Amino acid sequence: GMAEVEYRCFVGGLAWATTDQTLGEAFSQFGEILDSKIINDRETGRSRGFGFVTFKDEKAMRDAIEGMNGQDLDGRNITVNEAQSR
């Protein structure tokens, strides 16, 4: 709703059971999502413990960052921060 483009947010400190399915919808409650993917660990077959969330709007991303940073998502307090458009 100002600059419509990929707003990439970095979410680190997820749980190893955190799926992009659970990740996405959690952030869908805050803002417009375009993409939400968990970076998995190929080597062990786990998650890396972090993922990326793509917003459609800057503000939709902003609120989601402050609102999600610190709370729990899938059994871990998640750390959410600014990653800017990538």
From TrEMBL:
Single GO term (MF): mRNA binding
The RRM domain, residue ranges: 7-85
GO biological process, one term: miRNA transport
Keywords for this protein: RNA-binding
Protein name (Swiss-Prot/TrEMBL): Glycine-rich RNA-binding protein
Species annotation: Nicotiana tabacum
